[PDB]
Design a protein around this ligand. Structure first.
Ligand code: ADP
Lengths: 134, 687
């Protein structure tokens, strides 16, 4: 319908809530009619494992007050570094960059020039069974 | 049944006030558009251009001097389709008609409308004679003649056309009014509520069709009653009509039998194309759509494919639905009608005005040290490589040619290759060159195959043509090419076929064409594994044969020697990039590209001619080159052979070097600059 045109690209996972309605004269005029559809609808895109947006997570004032209480410290980079190895021993300086890639850096596109790339790309190498697939 | 609605929009006094504005305008000798209409009456022009600003200037003018004007900007802005002919019939009220005796060679269209003007009046002169001869102030006597005679309609004999023009924000900046028609809007921003409005879109011209005439009205000769029947068609298809529809063939036993005619019908120029989205305001996970735009009349043959253009027009549906079973009952398929073209990146070889041009060009000329200022200005966002930028400035020139006549041409094209890896950031310049330069297509290695960048054959839509590729597109322009080392080997063969000019041979399944291409080539390949081994030779760290290197007149090398003193300026260079958004400081001001290309395009129309003293200087200088090149004959740091094509380039170069003097003054210092860029381009591998 009107305010609901084009909320989805083809290839996502979306919940649809509406009414299952069958219209049309089912072949009794003059081999099967009664084709069906669903109208009166609301559209809700939902997060996949590997597709689409997951940024619908809310933030309360109770939430951000904890963040503002958190950011007033001096060593939280260490705690966030040690946090991301829940079941993996070691690899301290590796985890530090994994914070920073999700930060993504800053982007400043030049005036009538070109963009300057801001993100960070990392390859690792090591012997097998050493938390590479972990 | 079928009620009625009143609305504040009037048709009566708007027609009255639009007559006055069409007459009373003096600001921009006598009246503006009547002198234009006299120029239309001079029978030498086909278009009528109407702004919105002089309207708004008049609408400012009437309120400040008189009581009240009806609003007319937002009046046209709403519906905009009824304002075509209701405005244009007021034009035919006032006309300096006999303003020039007709030329015998003027127009075959002109001799027909002169008849229908005269045949109207001679038929008008007959009926007023009979009525006064049968009597029982003369305005009613005139009025009886008005309704008792079939005539030609005034819509049938027009000969001119009218295009509207949107208002800029500039006068709207002074007085804010309904400036909603002129915003850079997207196809995604086209909601289905903007139908009938006047809009402004932009994008990329893609899949341009061909121009073919569109039939509008058809004449029909009676051959018995001697009338002419006229049928107006606004549908997609139509039908021929019956045996006759006269008033005199009517009420009679034997009706006629008709047939149409060609020379008496009215046609129209017709061609359409599609516009792809600008690919900058697209959301983060979307694919760009397209849109159909019909073009009619004068504005045809003005839109090359693959450009950046501002299209303004009015938004109308077309009666069409998709599949038969999928029809929900009222499905409206839309389009846009073109009204005005404003192109970004104004194309060269299309201007002749010089006065307001040299209002800024002479200030560039009188700035002093212009030639060194230019290569500083093209893509200044890297550090160093000034001589490298200087040769690319000369690549932007090109622009020389000669045919001996009943013979061969010579191509005035420059083909500079780039070698080196990787921290020089060559692709920063590769995107920059095809960006400023008009007709610039950025290409990669594998993303076009051997059939991609050349033409292809597909089934034509509504209007079996040869659909071309990027090099077919980027003719009379510069192609930016990445990773020539990883092309197909058949794709290499086409590139050798461009080094002889205009040649693209095809021997496929049904195609034998040899199409033409005025293209220009920039290439940049990377060296071998490792980086700069002096134990390795030239052509040892190169993955291409030297016959291809013989086709390259100019070659560079991108060294990277880590030197202690070169870093600190470059470190201050790159850190200043993120401190601001502009590099130079207190010593230089950059040239904006729009003013830059106009000085280029004016320099493209010079054609300097050589002299005899410069003939003497080059010959023995080529004996300098021919002698010392053929004393090594080795696979050492020096390259093997010296072609006569080297002399073919350097004569062409100093010819192109003379073009930036704009003076036809081929001199000794003209050639003195040309020899310096040869010896430094080669053999920079010494450090
Ligand atoms: N430092 C470590 N701490 C805990 N577990 C580890 C550690 N190193 C390796 N592992 C174990 O290694 C396994 C993952 O093997 P991995 O090295 O990721 O695969 P591959 O080398 O084939 O990519 C996990 O099951 C994990 O239990």
């Amino acid at each position: 319908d009107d305010d609901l045109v084009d909320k989805t690209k083809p290839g996502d996972r979306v919940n649809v809530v509406g009414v299952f309605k069958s219209l049309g004269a089912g072949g009794m005029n003059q081999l099967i009619g009664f084709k069906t559809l669903i109208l009166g609808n609301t559209v809700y895109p939902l997060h996949a494992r590997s597709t689409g947006v997951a940024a619908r997570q809310m933030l309360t004032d109770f939430d951000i007050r904890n963040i503002n209480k958190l950011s007033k410290k001096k060593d939280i980079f260490d705690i966030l570094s040690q946090s991301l190895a829940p079941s993996i021993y070691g690899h301290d300086h590796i985890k530090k960059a994994i914070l920073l890639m999700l930060m993504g850096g800053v982007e400043k596109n030049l005036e009538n020039g070109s963009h300057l790339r801001g993100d960070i790309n990392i390859l690792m190498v090591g012997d097998p069974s050493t938390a590479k697939s972990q | 049944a079928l009620p009625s609605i009143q609305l504040p929009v009037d048709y009566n006094n708007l027609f009255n006030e639009i007559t006055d504005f069409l007459v009373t305008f003096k600001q921009d000798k006598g009246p503006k558009y009547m002198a234009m209409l006299q120029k239309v009456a001079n029978r030498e022009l086909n278009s009528v251009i109407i702004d919105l600003d002089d309207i708004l200037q008049y609408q400012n003018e009437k309120f400040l001097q008189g009581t009240q004007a009806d609003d007319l900007v937002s009046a046209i802005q709403q519906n905009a389709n009824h304002f075509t002919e209701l405005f244009c019939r007021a034009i035919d009220n006032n006309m300096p008609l006999p303003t020039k005796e007709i030329d015998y060679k003027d127009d075959v269209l002109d001799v027909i409308l002169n008849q229908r003007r005269l045949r109207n009046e001679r038929m008008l002169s007959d009926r007023t004679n009979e009525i006064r001869s049968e009597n029982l102030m003369n305005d009613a006597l005139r009025e009886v003649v008005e309704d008792e005679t079939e005539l030609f309609p005034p819509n049938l004999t027009r000969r001119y056309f009218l295009y509207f023009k949107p208002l800029s924000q500039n006068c709207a900046r002074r007085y804010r009014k309904k400036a909603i028609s002129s915003k850079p809007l997207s196809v995604r921003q086209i909601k289905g509520d903007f139908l009938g409005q006047l809009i402004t879109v932009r994008g990329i011209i893609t899949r341009v069709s061909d121009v073919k005439p569109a039939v509008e009205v058809i004449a029909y000769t009676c051959d018995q009653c001697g009338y002419e029947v006229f049928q107006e068609v606004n549908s997609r298809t139509f039908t021929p009509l019956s045996e006759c529809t006269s008033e005199e063939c009517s009420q009679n036993q034997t009706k006629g039998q008709l047939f149409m005619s060609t020379r008496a019908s009215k046609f129209s120029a017709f061609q359409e194309c599609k516009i792809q989205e600008l690919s900058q305001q697209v959301p983060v996970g979307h694919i760009p759509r397209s849109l159909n735009i019909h073009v009619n009349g004068t504005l045809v043959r003005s839109l090359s494919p693959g450009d950046i253009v501002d299209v303004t027009g009015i938004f109308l549906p077309a009666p069409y639905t998709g599949f038969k079973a999928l029809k929900a009952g009222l499905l409206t398929e839309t389009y846009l009608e073109a009204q005005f073209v404003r192109q970004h990146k104004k194309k060269f070889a299309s201007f002749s005005l010089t006065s307001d041009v040299e209002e800024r060009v002479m200030e560039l000329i009188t700035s002093g040290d212009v030639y060194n200022r230019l290569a500083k200005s093209i893509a200044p966002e890297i550090y160093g490589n000034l001589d490298v930028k200087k040769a690319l400035l000369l690549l932007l020139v090109g622009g020389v040619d000669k045919r001996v006549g009943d013979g061969m041409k010579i191509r005035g094209d420059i083909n500079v290759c780039l070698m080196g890896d990787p921290g020089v950031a060559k692709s920063q310049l590769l995107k920059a060159i095809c960006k400023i330069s008009p007709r610039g297509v950025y290409t990669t290695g594998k993303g076009s195959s051997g059939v991609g960048l050349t033409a292809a054959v597909m089934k034509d839509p509504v209007t079996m043509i040869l659909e071309g590729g990027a090099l077919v597109l980027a003719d009379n322009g510069i192609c930016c090419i990445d990773e020539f080392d990883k092309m197909d080997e058949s794709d290499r063969t086409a590139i050798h076929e461009v080094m002889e000019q205009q040649t693209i041979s095809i021997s496929k399944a049904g195609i034998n064409t040899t199409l033409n291409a005025r293209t220009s080539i920039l290439a940049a390949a990377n060296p071998l594994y490792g980086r700069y081994n002096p134990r390795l030779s030239p052509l040892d760290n190169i993955n291409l044969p030297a016959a291809l290197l013989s086709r390259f007149d100019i070659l560079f090398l991108m060294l990277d020697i880590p030197s202690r003193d070169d870093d600190e300026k470059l470190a201050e260079h790159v850190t200043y990039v993120h401190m601001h958004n502009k590099q130079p400081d207190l010593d230089f001001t950059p040239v904006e590209p729009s003013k830059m290309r106009e000085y280029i395009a004016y320099a493209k129309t010079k054609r300097p001619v050589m002299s005899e003293a410069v003939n003497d200087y080059v010959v023995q200088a080529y004996i300098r080159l021919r002698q010392d090149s053929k004393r090594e004959m080795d696979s050492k740091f020096s390259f093997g052979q010296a072609t006569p094509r080297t002399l073919l380039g350097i004569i062409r170069l100093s010819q192109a070097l003379a073009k930036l003097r704009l003076a036809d003054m081929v001199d000794i210092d003209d050639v003195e600059e040309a020899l310096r860029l040869v010896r430094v381009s080669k053999e920079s591998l010494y450090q």
